[PDB]
Design a protein around this ligand. Structure first.
Ligand SMILES: Nc1ncnc2c1ncn2[C@@H]1O[C@H](COP(=O)(O)OP(=O)(O)OP(=O)(O)O)[C@@H](O)[C@H]1O
Ligand SMILES: Nc1ncnc2c1ncn2[C@@H]1O[C@H](COP(=O)(O)OP(=O)(O)OP(=O)(O)O)[C@@H](O)[C@H]1O
Ligand SMILES: Nc1ncnc2c1ncn2[C@@H]1O[C@H](COP(=O)(O)OP(=O)(O)OP(=O)(O)O)[C@@H](O)[C@H]1O
Ligand SMILES: Nc1ncnc2c1ncn2[C@@H]1O[C@H](COP(=O)(O)OP(=O)(O)OP(=O)(O)O)[C@@H](O)[C@H]1O
Ligand SMILES: Nc1ncnc2c1ncn2[C@@H]1O[C@H](COP(=O)(O)OP(=O)(O)OP(=O)(O)O)[C@@H](O)[C@H]1O
Ligand SMILES: Nc1ncnc2c1ncn2[C@@H]1O[C@H](COP(=O)(O)OP(=O)(O)OP(=O)(O)O)[C@@H](O)[C@H]1O
Ligand SMILES: [Mg+2]
Ligand SMILES: [Mg+2]
Ligand SMILES: [Mg+2]
Ligand SMILES: [Mg+2]
Ligand SMILES: [Mg+2]
Ligand SMILES: [Mg+2]
Lengths: 299, 302, 294, 301, 297, 296
């Protein structure tokens, strides 16, 4: 193990295992090894994510495609048992320009999708002790198999699954080989699926990119997609009907990512409520206007 | 006395795999093992654990027949070949090629249909942080493969295990790979042990390890007829349209598609064609409509 | 790990005690070993001599930075009415060198009231395998533990370089880990990562999106040069009639804040050499400034 | 605890000891330590080897040089006792490209040469327990001295004797230092010679390379050498009297190692006889004589 | 192991056993059996009811239906030979959960004669004394026919056999394996074990413990039941006290952790009354707030 | 054990126990119990008051009202069964703080019989002797009913159990777990332990230590209080001496660091008086002596 020895890590693992058993009572009889228990600290429950698929704007076709091709085949195998071709992908890639909502879809998958979610970082695998990283990867796949509808999420997967080179470190090379062997090898994986989000799809190795067959292009939002982005972002605000012209705001945000639109919303909200902020600091928020956004917009 | 592989579930897996091996070959009941060989026993792959036969791999029929006549028959039927010393099975086999073209499929078919005892070894079973334990693990792997006399030591992604040795290589990894070369082809040669590897990067393998893999199978990208064969195999046990489905057009337009790409395309086509049935069943919780060429070519890029 | 050194352990204990004195609620907080090593990089108050009143020219940028960064972060009760009023996840200071970005970070460290972590590439890279990623993860977990926290990366162009094949494996996986913790599945608390850079094109786009609030600390305007000269020449004897700051500001064309500092230092030093000579054996005037001007 | 705790290990050690005493009756009076008993499992007898010096083709000058400079100075010291310089080397390095015949020569030294053979491996040397590896190395040298004409063969010796650095393990550092001391130190090994085989000679430490002073370069075969290797491999195999032309195959196999030629011969015999095995498998008469085309169809030409 | 206090304890336990079961009277005991008699646990020495263990009701029911009733009432199960009592029982799990509570309730409410043996009574410095002690333990257990031999933290006694073990430890383990299941099999004797490290137990020793109970960490409803049991005969506020909130917010808590939390909460709630009593009505009824001060949410 | 000096010490401790608690008379102790009796410490041997621990006043009060009063005054806490004393107490934190100081103050004036055991007493070479020693330790602690068994540096004794541990250490730990919380539970016996490495302690052993006190490094106010306590019964200047400056510049210091600083400052301030005495009063302490050694 050599990572779940600390008392805080053991407490985290017990919390996550208790949550998993509460969600799936059949997991009570499932026993884990020390390395699998080390992986348990990477289990991410729907309670940790405060983000629903409803908070995703401009990706409704992508969400429906993701559902009907990924979520339901993984989560409803009885429905899809008419043909053996109706299966969940062995991997899923969410690739696109930065700020368009790949990790948003990952958070919604952690929350809304029934699948147990393991979000694994490189730091939780790379161990300086010899041969520990490969055992950690093997136990991650073993634990994902034991929690049978599991999703292994690797954020920024381009670095994890980088094109193998002769200059790669030995432990990294054995890590990548072990991941390729367990991901698709002699021994099949039962309803275990790997999800990756990345900005550079070309940095991913060809043999790793092959193991991510279902790829979702979370591209820069269109005009309508920006309209839905703004509608989702300015939820739970004033949004006066006469003072606000959302369509003009959406068309003025040419080449704007979702994170940039969040920044624009935050700036406009801070500027519009600044008088109320000063009054509250000394001791209502004015309706949001197109003037505030247009002042913050370049146009 | 290895410090790893002594877990209770690991011991249960070793007992189960040994039971399966003894049931397959009753002569192995008298065979005794050391503890390190018992930890190697967890990597034994028994034919019931594999769902893939040689009939499930399409477009590699010349390769499959060549693999049979040059690898499987000289190893599994030595009495037929016991007339010339040059008719012996190769000491190693390399299935190399672009990703997704069917190397693990051939490994699965070798584990199932060949009848050789199969050890699929991963590096996490070999690397041990304790000093001189990886070498003992490798020695036990070769000793166990010699005890189960017709054996295949399969190492998937063997280009990482048998990578080009260098001065920057780790000490334990260097002695591990040197021990692997010594046991693979050295003094006291193995009886009927064959080491099969699968790589995407053949040029990453060391020259000495490569020499020890004299039989090389290039599982290259499929051609038009080969892609038709893969599409026909993948679309078996599935309702297909009559006088409307054009598999030849799909195979022709899938230029550069590996077998995994065709598998994903077939999966997506089945998901698209059955979507109305999926909705109807979800409402409950006709049948799947026959797959047309328009269904395949909708998402197929030309 | 750097926590083996006796001096490093003493520094970590001193920084932890300063943090606990600042925030008494941190007494019950336990830290990992890697977070303890990150504790050596923490810049508590009463170490920085730079105040927000010590920066001239960029006072509108100071007020904008306050109202958009410090108050949203340090006063969540005022901004808690709406979920769009939270502090930015990242803040960028970019422009030409010598314009006061480092003082802006220093005044933020002294005056904002949030715990300040100043990290560097040299203090983040480790010799062993996987220790850099664990160190980055501990940095983010520590910044979450000290709930109002500002992580500073001076010369953030090098730390957040655009990813390419020429980058080392350790650096690439470090940057990916930084991305994952900065904006990933697990939302951070009131953690803000701030960097000062000279080149804005060297920053990765996926790291630029993580710095939504960008402040252009550019070359000063003429009124800004006047404010800079007034701040720099404070508590200094100046002539009531001979000294005139207007033409000093007007003649300084294409001069940054560091260049204005250099001009002020030379003008003060040529006059103070006479005082040193008198000691061995006069207010500052404009003519000394104009002599060095070209 | 000590290594080799298996009952099969005890059976192997006792069998090898009985073989050694049968070969040389003088060894019966020699008592062994526990670690020397564990080293006894690495004893290689000529009955375990089926490769003689006649099975190695294209290396006749190297084989004769190896004999007259290594085997005869060691196995027949009476002849060489006239001069103190006429002595066996402290070590022998068989280095070269992979597949060229170094392990063939080691097998032939184990079989034909009368020296007791210790084919040691790193799995029988390295031990996790403290100080056991050094005692194993010491007892290896003690046993080699007891079985007085002895060859300690370490295959892939570039990993055992790799260039020492500050990054090596403490156990390996003391292991290498103990091997260095016993190999060439104060106390003199009588007729113990350490033969090594490697592909990377440059990976060996200079202080260990100087302990392997008789170096044999088993290089890639020439056309004459390839002809001899093919003639050796194709012996006791039916070949065509007229259509078969070995010289053309030898000329066309440029850069082919001995292993490459062995694989070529194996696949040529498989494809040439393929009608015979098909009939036999149908049943379950005569193998067709091998022709030039059988090697040509498997060659690049 | 002979001393005046120990001899008095042995005599007291023997009269307790004789008064409990008249058949056990007029039975000759060896000196080593007499020494083993000091480890006999009687029902009055245990203050734990089966009702004092909450959150394990399926485990209590399974224990009664598979362990206690087959051992205690063979007459009901006499029709089929397959309904016999287990040779051994293992109560394994993480520390904190009620393995010792289960063992205490077995010592009090199963009705079997109980031998709670410890390593001090078994291990003996002199030659061959420990094996004779184990032999006498099994002989005494056979003499009191419905006997339970409870070895708490049984992973230390039944640890995996190795060469590094002492000669006397290996002989002890082999003697225990021989008497546990060998020739001349025992009567209604069951060796109940409790441990945290099940993997440390030897394979043959685990084989001799067929019926294994996993007393895992409590779930939310099990925590609610444990908190309800621990707060029995304790005044609780009618409206302020919310036990479900405390059960849901004590994630990862074992039963011992809940006991300590309840003790600390009671102390904090009754601090004012305790100070008033020390310097001179009743303890203040416990609220949710008292537990949430100590809670880390 | 089984020595003339050892038996004399055991007899002396037994007379001290019977003198303090008259009900302990006519109580028979086994040979191993008599051996454990040499580890009994008494208020005479400990010359440290709870008032001699500065800065830890909230910890002192918490320790009192949650440990000492529930253990030594059971009549007050009688009505509610949940008001019992903890089965164990752990004092953990960085070295230098008052963990042993707290243990000494508990040994003096908590009123409990104290067994300050060390690993030389418990661990024995002979077979089964250490388990019998632990059993007799618990039997003696139960006999002296309000007892406290203090094990300084308890991380080593209660370390995480492993199969690579010696069989006697594993058996010793299992016996300690069984007697600490098992069948036939102890009376008013509490196991207090001090450590710097709480993470080294086993999960079952840490479970058996429910009450845990973090004696962390002193703050500025705590440093002032510790300096005031350490500089008691010594002469300090009325005008030159200011404790707040020294407490401010002693950043990151523990109590031990302050004790050594105070000792160095006292030596340097009394150096000339000591030289005069060696040739043949104490100069009042000023801030110059403390800030001279201080590196700020
Ligand atoms: N489809 C969307 N719906 C709603 N908000 C969105 C959407 N896309 C982006 N955003 C906003 O922009 C932010 C982008 O964060 P996120 O982590 O999802 O980006 P990303 O696409 O994964 O980028 P990167 O991989 O570079 O981190 C979100 O937190 C949200 O505030
Ligand atoms: N010739 C084929 N016939 C049928 N299916 C195939 C064929 N080739 C590949 N596939 C499909 O591709 C999937 C992946 O297994 P495959 O054997 O292709 O991996 P691989 O070729 O070893 O590539 P990698 O080295 O990247 O693992 C299989 O599930 C299989 O369904
Ligand atoms: N507004 C200002 N008021 C006073 N001095 C200033 C101001 N701006 C810059 N300076 C001077 O510029 C010098 C250069 O440091 P400064 O903080 O400006 O660097 P910077 O803008 O962060 O540049 P870089 O990225 O090259 O480090 C300072 O030492 C300071 O004297
Ligand atoms: N000179 C030769 N004559 C006949 N056969 C040869 C010759 N060299 C090699 N071979 C064939 O190649 C096979 C392997 O050769 P060998 O094991 O000696 O390789 P090597 O030179 O030791 O390389 P490595 O050090 O990588 O093992 C032998 O079984 C033999 O049949
Ligand atoms: N299921 C439960 N119901 C009620 N109280 C419990 C339960 N489990 C534990 N407790 C409380 O916790 C205390 C300790 O529990 P117990 O003695 O069963 O643990 P243990 O099995 O000895 O731990 P270990 O596994 O470390 O030996 C008991 O005094 C009891 O009050
Ligand atoms: N709170 C305090 N008030 C006064 N003096 C103190 C205090 N804490 C420590 N000291 C000084 O430290 C000395 C004892 O230190 P102590 O042994 O308690 O440290 P510790 O934390 O127990 O060390 P360790 O954990 O390494 O055993 C005493 O002589 C005392 O002068
Ligand atoms: Mg992202
Ligand atoms: Mg594959
Ligand atoms: Mg700067
Ligand atoms: Mg060789
Ligand atoms: Mg217990
Ligand atoms: Mg102490």
């Amino acid at each position: 193990p050599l990572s779940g020895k600390s008392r805080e890590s053991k407490a985290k693992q017990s919390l996550q295992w208790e949550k998993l058993v509460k969600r799936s009572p059949a997991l009570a009889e499932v026993t884990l090894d020390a390395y699998e228990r080390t992986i348990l600290s990477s289990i991410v429950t729907p309670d940790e994510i405060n983000i629903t698929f409803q908070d995703i704007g401009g990706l409704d076709p992508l969400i429906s495609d993701l559902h009907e091709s990924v979520i339901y085949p993984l989560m409803m195998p009885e429905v899809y048992s008419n043909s053996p071709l109706l299966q969940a992908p062995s991997g899923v890639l969410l690739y696109g320009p930065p700020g368009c909502g790949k990790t948003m879809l990952a958070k919604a998958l952690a929350k809304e999708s029934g699948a147990n979610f393991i979000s694994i970082r490189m730091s939780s695998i790379m161990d300086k002790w010899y041969g520990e990283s490969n055992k950690i990867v093997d136990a991650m796949f073993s634990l994902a198999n034991k929690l049978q509808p599991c999703i292994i999420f690797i954020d920024q997967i381009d670095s994890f699954l980088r094109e193998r080179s002769s200059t790669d470190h030995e432990v990294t090379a054995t890590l990548k080989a072990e991941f390729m062997t367990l991901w698709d090898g002699l021994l099949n994986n039962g309803r275990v699926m790997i999800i990756g989000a990345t900005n550079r799809i070309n940095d991913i190795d060809d043999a790793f990119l092959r193991r991510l067959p279902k790829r979702f292009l979370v591209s820069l939002p269109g005009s309508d997609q920006r309209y839905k982005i703004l509608s989702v972002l300015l939820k739970d605000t004033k949004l006066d009907e006469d003072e606000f012209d959302l369509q003009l705001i959406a068309d003025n945000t040419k080449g704007f990512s979702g994170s940039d639109l969040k920044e624009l919303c935050r700036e406009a909200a801070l500027d519009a409520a600044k008088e109320y902020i000063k009054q509250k600091r000394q001791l209502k928020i004015r309706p949001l206007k197109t003037k505030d956004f247009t002042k913050k917009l370049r146009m």
